[PDB]
Design a binder for these strands. Structure first.
Lengths: 150, 171, 139, 52, 126, 149
RNA sequence: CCCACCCAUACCCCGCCCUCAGGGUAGAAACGAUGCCCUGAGGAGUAGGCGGCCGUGGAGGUCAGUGACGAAGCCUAGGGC
RNA sequence: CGGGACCGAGGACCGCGCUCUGCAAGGAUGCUGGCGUAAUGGUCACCAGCGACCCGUCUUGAAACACGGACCAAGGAGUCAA
RNA sequence: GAGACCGAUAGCGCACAAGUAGAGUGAUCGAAAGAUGAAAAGCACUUUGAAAAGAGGGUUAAAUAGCACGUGAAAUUGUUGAAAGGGAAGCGCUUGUGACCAGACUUGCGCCCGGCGGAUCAUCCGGUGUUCUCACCGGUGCACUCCGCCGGGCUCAGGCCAG
């Protein structure tokens, strides 16, 4: 016998999505290839967040994007691996280039009306395969009723 | 109807049977086992002797707490009895089979009991009254009987083995 | 667009009507499936370029997908019957499988399937009689 | 009898599923994978003239 | 035809795993059941008792589901079913299903002879 | 086993019976070994014991894995920054206790020895000076290593 | 006190199973990528927790499925996984 | 330098090497004989050597006590709603 | 009029002369129990028995369906065959004996000769289709070229146990 005071630890992170979305499966295959064949940490972060569940992908609004676009970030490509929502409190949308998992209809319309560009994550992989000149944004994770009641 | 001994052809044999016969299955089993494999005339004479209490049927399986007699010494036992009713039923069946053989044209004097078998019939359900207002079964255990009478009647060796055999045949 | 060979494979990889699943393996009834095995490489109905071989009365009949007629099933198959020497059939099949970059990964399987069909079209030899063995079977 | 026999589905999800099925009906490999005999069909989706 | 060359087929255990006390009770089938009693000697693995099945008895991955000839069985119901084994005559053998009639069995056997596919139960219904 | 000897054996990487390790003799290690004396036999190995242990049962720890020392490229890939490029350099470092003894001895996976050919003394769990096998047996550890390797 | 010897599921070497971990695999001659290839370690278990599979009655789809040239059921010191 | 035992995983080449026309160097080949069938192998029944308490259930820390079980077939117990 | 309900120990207590038969002074309590076969063709006639029935012999597609009736499991029993047994049997590991069996194998592929039977040999021309350079079809082969078959010879690979 071998005395094992310590225990070998099985993985406590997602290795694959629980979702059955076929397009998400194709995106996961593409970003698995990118994370394997590139040095860019952006690709690994994007792959890991593609694995994530919905409460771990809180929505990001246009006002949050506009806040993070200030101070030299106006020309960077905004990357969100959640839903980009519209904020009607923001009356003037700045010109921006946003790549997201999905957009609401009003957010897409307001970005295109302000003159920015809307992309999917496979288009982001085509144009910035190393994540160059990107601004990676996450939504407020703790802004949930369950988290308030914890 | 299908008899249990299916290997016996019907052309040179005689058969008889009886069903739902209200006679003791255990006593009938002992009597049939006593006359199993015998000649027909010897079996008939023995069963008449059983009725007349001159020859006894040895009790072998269904024999618990029965009596003893001097007539079991012919069979090498001490427990033997005289099941008259079983003997009468078996005499009737054996005589029916003898008549069947005579109709078929077989020689009666050379016939042997090749197959004889007693099976349990469905039980007759009477009731008896016991103490304290209780009712118990008082059942009869009848039997089916069937009987059939018939007439009394160097390869792949090794090369060394082959060479040894050839040399031993030569010398 | 919304439709591709990868998308069709994701849709039909767990179940389709050509699937034959048993304990010892998963087979496919697809006419465009060389080796009749369930995989993305051999899923001919899934793939944009695909080959299938069926027996003819004499020789083989090879079907290939036309890429510009994927929405026209009546005119989507390029069909050639090879009823000649087996070497000529193998040469032509390898040519349409490898020379112009049309599924070069399938040329071994295609030549093997043509060889199997042409081999099956030979007369069968009479089997030796069954040898009875032992005691109960021999007597 | 007061078991839940019926299922309430969002109308948007119903319309999504109907649109997805309509898009899948235009893919000729999916017709063969669902078991339809469409080898002699001249074009998918098959449109016949309304005069007929 | 002869099977594809393979490593020798090793069975770690050929005896079945008999259920405890099924030899003594006729209402107990011999099919294996794990004893869940806290004081059970088979469950506690006292020596001289019945063995318990476990993953250590598992067969070699290269020879799993191989019959002694080296083929894997594939159940077939008709000629089109047996024609799926056209490319796999060195690895797969055909087992005709039990509810196939004698004429269809004759057709299946003839087609499998043409394809060079071994039939495991070719002598039946003849 | 009490928790303090259990912890000392864990820190010495003696997690299994007939596991063996090389230790540089300091006071800080000598007191530990003196505490775990009821479970260990230890001594002063010679060059033959060192080289035969490393040649026959030498396994390096590479990325957490136990890799046999069958080529000098493995030793150069894992210990080359300390000047150890071959198995003879590793043996020299272990035997002479060089400046990189910690790295060499920790690179060596704990040696998994067999039971001794010839067995132990009749009462195994007594001290060596009392006729048993436990404790410091000094240069007599080479006979045990020869029987066990 | 000394020499030799006996054997545990303990220790050493080798095979096989499973689990865990670490790597490789697309201008695809390309894959049940839910696959395959390489390397290492580990294996008792009540209460309790989790995962994967097997089986039964019924429903949708599918296999152009089986069947009076014999379906289902039942018996079987006959076999295969 | 002898004598013996057990094993042969892998499956084009690639590597580290050496005594370098080649090799014992990232895992067995070569030669030969008998047989080609119940001979090997398997299943069943029995003898033989060794091994081996009757199952739940309850109790406490555990045993013992106690309780259930003559046998077989069919039902037979964490479900539905808010 | 219907059902992702139940399928005769289920579903109403009741698929049947069921709120019946039966029980209780009474109020009330309250079962069990479906299926030969397509068609009775439900066994003429002979024979043995007092009879019940038995045996022949018909009827049927089948009586291995005989108003005990579709199928006919287990407990339990009879006969036959095999075996064991000096105060329990049963079970595990491993041989042995006896009995009974599943596979595997029967030859394949490739060269060199000889004999047949045919020209879907190579090239070129035209047409057509294609993945746009690859193929198919018709003409040309005039037999040192292709394709099958039959006789020999040779190499290699082939089943079981062994040295």
């Amino acid at each position: 016998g071998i005395d094992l005071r310590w225990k070998h630890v099985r993985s406590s992170h997602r290795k694959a999505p629980k979702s059955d979305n076929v397009y998400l499966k194709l995106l996961v295959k593409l970003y698995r290839f990118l994370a394997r064949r590139t040095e860019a940490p952006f690709n690994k972060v994007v792959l890991r967040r593609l694995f994530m569940s919905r409460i771990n992908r809180p929505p990001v609004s246009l006002s949050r994007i506009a806040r993070n676009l200030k101070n030299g970030n106006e020309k960077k490509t905004v990357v969100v691996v959640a839903t980009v929502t519209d904020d009607n409190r923001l009356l003037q949308v700045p010109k921006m280039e946003v790549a997201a998992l999905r957009f609401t209809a009003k957010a897409r319309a307001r970005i295109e009306a302000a003159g920015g560009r809307t992309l999917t994550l496979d288009q982001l992989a085509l144009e910035k395969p190393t994540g160059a000149n990107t601004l990676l944004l996450r939504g407020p994770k703790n802004a949930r009723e369950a988290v308030k009641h914890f | 109807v299908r008899y249990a001994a299916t290997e016996i052809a019907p052309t040179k044999s005689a058969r008889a049977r009886g069903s739902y016969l209200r006679v003791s299955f255990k006593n009938t089993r002992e009597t049939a086992q006593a006359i199993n494999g015998w000649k027909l005339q010897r079996a008939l004479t023995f069963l008449q002797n059983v009725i007349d209490k001159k020859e006894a049927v040895p009790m072998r399986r269904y024999a618990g707490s029965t009596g003893r007699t001097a007539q079991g010494k012919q069979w090498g036992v001490s427990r033997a009895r005289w099941p008259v009713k079983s003997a009468q039923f078996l005499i009737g069946l054996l005589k029916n089979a003898e008549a069947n053989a005579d109709a078929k044209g077989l020689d009666t004097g050379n016939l042997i009991i090749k197959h004889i078998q007693v099976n349990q019939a469905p039980k007759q359900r009477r009731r008896t009254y016991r103490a304290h207002g209780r009712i118990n079964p008082y059942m009869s255990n009848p039997c089916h009987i069937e009987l059939i009478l018939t007439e009394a009647e160097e390869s792949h060796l090794s090369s060394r083995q082959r060479g040894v055999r050839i040399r031993r045949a030569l010398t | 667009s919304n439709v591709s060979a990868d998308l069709i494979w994701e849709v039909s990889r767990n179940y389709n009507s050509f699937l034959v699943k048993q304990r010892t393996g998963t087979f496919s009834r697809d006419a465009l499936n060389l080796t009749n095995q369930h995989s993305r490489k051999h899923a001919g109905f899934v793939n944009d370029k695909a080959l299938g071989i069926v027996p003819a009365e004499k020789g083989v009949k090879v079907i290939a997908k036309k890429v510009k007629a994927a929405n026209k099933p009546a005119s989507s198959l390029y069909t050639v019957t090879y009823k000649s020497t087996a070497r000529k059939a193998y040469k032509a099949i390898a040519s349409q499988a490898a020379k112009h970059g049309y599924r070069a990964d399938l040329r071994q399987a295609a030549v093997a399937r043509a060889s199997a069909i042409l081999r099956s079209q030979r007369p069968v030899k009479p089997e030796p009689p069954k040898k009875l063995r032992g005691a109960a079977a021999r007597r | 009898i007061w078991r839940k026999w019926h299922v309430k589905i969002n109308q948007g999800q119903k319309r999504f599923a109907t649109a997805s099925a309509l898009a899948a009906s235009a893919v000729a490999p999916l017709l063969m994978a669902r078991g339809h005999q469409v080898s002699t069909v001249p074009e998918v989706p098959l449109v016949v003239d309304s005069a007929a | 035809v002869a099977a594809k060359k393979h490593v020798p087929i090793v069975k770690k255990r050929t005896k079945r795993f008999m259920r405890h006390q099924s030899d003594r009770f006729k209402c107990l089938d011999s099919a294996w059941r794990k004893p869940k009693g806290i004081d059970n000697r088979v469950r506690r693995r006292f020596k001289g008792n019945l063995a318990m099945p476990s993953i250590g008895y598992g067969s070699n991955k290269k020879t799993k589901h191989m019959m002694p000839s080296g083929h894997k069985a594939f159940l077939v119901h008709n000629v089109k079913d047996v024609e799926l084994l056209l490319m796999h005559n060195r690895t797969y053998a055909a087992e005709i299903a039990h509810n196939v009639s004698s004429r269809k069995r004759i057709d299946i056997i003839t087609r499998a002879k043409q394809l060079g596919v071994k039939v495991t139960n070719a002598k039946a219904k003849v | 086993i009490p928790p303090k000897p259990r912890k000392i054996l864990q820190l010495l990487r003696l997690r299994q019976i007939n596991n063996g390790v090389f230790v540089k003799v300091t006071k800080a290690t000598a007191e530990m070994i003196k505490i775990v004396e009821p479970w260990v036999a230890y001594g002063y190995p010679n060059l033959k014991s060192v080289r035969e242990l490393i040649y026959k049962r030498g396994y390096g720890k590479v990325n957490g894995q136990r890799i046999p020392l069958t080529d000098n490229a493995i030793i150069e890939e894992n210990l080359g920054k300390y000047g150890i490029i071959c198995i003879e350099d590793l043996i020299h470092e272990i035997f002479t206790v060089g400046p990189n003894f910690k790295q060499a001895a920790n690179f060596l996976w704990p040696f998994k020895l067999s039971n001794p050919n010839g067995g132990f003394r009749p009462r195994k769990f007594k001290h060596f000076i009392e006729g048993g096998d436990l404790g410091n047996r000094e240069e007599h550890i080479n006979a045990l290593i020869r029987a066990m390797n």
